[PDB]
Amino acid sequence: DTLDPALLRLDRKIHIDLPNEQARLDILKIHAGPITKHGEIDYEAIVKLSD
Amino acid sequence: DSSIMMLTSDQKPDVMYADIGGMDIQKQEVREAVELPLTHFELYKQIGIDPPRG
Amino acid sequence: LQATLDMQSGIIHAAEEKDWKTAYSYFYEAFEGYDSIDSPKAITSLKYMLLCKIMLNTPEDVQALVSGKLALRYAGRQTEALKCVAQASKNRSLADFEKALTDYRAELRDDPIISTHLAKLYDNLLEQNLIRVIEPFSRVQIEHISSLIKLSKADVERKLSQM
Amino acid sequence: TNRADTLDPALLRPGRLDRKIEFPLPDRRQKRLIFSTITSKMNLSEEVDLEDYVARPDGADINSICQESGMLAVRENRYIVLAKDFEKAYKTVIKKDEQEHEF
Amino acid sequence: SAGFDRHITIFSPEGRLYQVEYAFKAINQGGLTSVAVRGKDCAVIVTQKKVPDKLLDSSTVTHLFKITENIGCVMTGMTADSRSQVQRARYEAANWKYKYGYEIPVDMLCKRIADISQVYTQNAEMRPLGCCMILIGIDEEQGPQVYKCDPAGYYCGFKATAAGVKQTESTSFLEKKVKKKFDWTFEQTVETAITCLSTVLSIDFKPSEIEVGVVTVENPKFRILTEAEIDAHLVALAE
Amino acid sequence: IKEIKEVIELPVKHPELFEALGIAQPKGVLLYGPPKTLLARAVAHH
Amino acid sequence: FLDTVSTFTSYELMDYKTFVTYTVYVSMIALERPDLREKVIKGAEILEVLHSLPAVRQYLFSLYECRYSVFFQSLAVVEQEMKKDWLFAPHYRYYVREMRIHAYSQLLESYRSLTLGYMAEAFGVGVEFIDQELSRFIAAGRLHCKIDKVNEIVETNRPDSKNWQYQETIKKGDLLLNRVQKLSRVINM
Amino acid sequence: SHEDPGNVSYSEIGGLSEQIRELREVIELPLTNPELFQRVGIIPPKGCLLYGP
Lengths: 51, 54, 163, 103, 239, 46, 189, 53
Fold this sequence. Notes:
part of a larger assembly; 8 chains; B: mainly alpha; 2 helices; flat; F: mainly alpha; 3 helices; 39% helix; 26S proteasome regulatory subunit 6B (chain B); Proteasome_alpha (chain E); acetylation (chain E); phosphoprotein (chain E); nucleus (chain E)
């Protein structure tokens, strides 16, 4: 928003949109691949644990 | 030199009148008040107008 | 009243004869000047214009004259004949133009001037046909060089002399 | 530039201003001819509306107009440019608060 | 721009004021959609509810506020402005009934509500009641009416009417739909209202979320539909 | 232009009339105002 | 008279049409074919007015296509005209025969294996006419070319860069050479 | 121009599922080939603008 209008004329303001349930859990997964874990991690628990 | 020295090649964008994105007021104005007056000596004098400037 | 007068100041500029390109820019000012003009007063306002356009051997101002929607903004079949008129103006093929002394005859019916229109076309075409019989070699019989123009001595002689 | 009010204190006076002709926003018939240019920059195969946006208040934007429309047809990966492509270039734009201050 | 930080209701340069055009999206913080349609001798209101809770009731979430026995309305935007505007409307309709001896036409009521909002706008040191109101009613010698009242005090009223969050799209569908000259035989109205909200929001949901308020020149009383007949219309448009 | 004379040619034309006075000559006139270059140049150019 | 933007009408311009007369009676000679078209054709400013005297105008029009029949018609015409026109009585003799020789120059310049009889048609019946004419004209030292009676030749010849463009060299570097020579002789004797 | 650390390809961070293709429609469109814009002709843009927390 700090940019002057004479400059803001950049085809469009592409956005990284807020990761929601699906996206939140996708990234949460990818952050937990190479763990010395087991088939134990409760997914929906962390899902609803999130805002 | 003044670091641009007119660029001396063909910096001419190779454009005609209407090709501009719709500025007919300025288009006509610049066209007939520059390209003719830029070279002329007598039409201005045919009405004693003046040698033009900026 | 003024619109007719500027169409004049172009026609005059082709009759008191300023120049083809001058009168044709005036024909644009006519063309894009036919804003909210009666169709019989505007579709014939483009009739003589597209005639002189096919005449000028070069529309030459395409992307504002024939890229304006006006040539696609008239009702009567007059403008649709003008459509093929402009098609020719683009092409202007001896394989299509001279054949069409009759296909352009209803188009020869509204011709503003009959002293210059196709006259200059065939004038140019003379040397345009002179760079096809003399294109092969420098020296040539003046007969078979003009067997292509089909007249070995009728007018080729004084024409090429003038050249 | 965007401004000229920071000027004309001595440039626009007897002697200096000899042939100064400001060139601001013009009338119309530009937007239409600009379409005819930029819409012809994209494909507009043979039959695609022009006036529906000429008279609709949705030159600098036409650059991004064709950007959106054409490069999404290239997201579609084909030449033929549609009249819907106008709309595709008329929704990602300065449409903040459509379409009348209402008062 | 500002610059002036638009804190009070004054005129800014070139040339607008920013308080009312900030109030025009106090509707948009409601998160809600309303559609009104007038085709023929009927008039239909449709508006959904956003109830995520099972502990929350369902009767007292109603936005359709029966103003008088022949005049209904629906509200969007923030709730307090809406309810206070509704009691002002009821009070002024009762004032009409006391002063002039007969039932108020829906035009004068919208004029009076708009004037109240303009007086709240003209004088400063009061918040300009950021809610939008759509009215319906039947009048003799004019048929049914649909009107809209702005927070600015700009009333208008027209055939197919929509205000809330997503109603640029709703008016786009209503331009693409009220252009064909067919009649609107009351199930045409109910079907077009349900399907216009069903294409704007694209949900295609239970009969328990939307509220339908109708008025018809056969029973000029304002009438709110029941779950059974709402379900009947919804499966009647289910092909 | 008359003032130009009075204040410029007085340091020029007749020094024998205010050296007879004995008091110093003037230096500056601040020929300011609405922008003067042209004529202020072309006049004493004579 | 190249102004044509400053001699519209004046107490000095007895008639702007007579201005056109004086102008053409020097422009059909001064104006070579390029200058011809430049001032007459291109310079349509005089055309908007010379629209009033189409005789010599159409003469000039033929003066490009080189139509020698009408050349001779209008040649007789303008001959009588100058014969009956001011400030020309004791001098108008050359102008017409000059037009003749000049036109014949280009006409022969067309090509060589050509005949005067083929042009006698354009000459009218101009076999004997041009016989004595061009006899006395080449006798007047004009228009290097070749023509016969028993053969009736035509020619394209006389290139300056054959010897003359190299003959002027001594023509002047001997004229002036001896000029300065005798001039630099009396400096001592 | 030289600090650039090589890392994962374009499937790590989520939420940009539809953005992955959006970014590619301008991110490899001229990179892969501009010759498409000889059939079409459209002049290439320069970029776009992002935002977010």
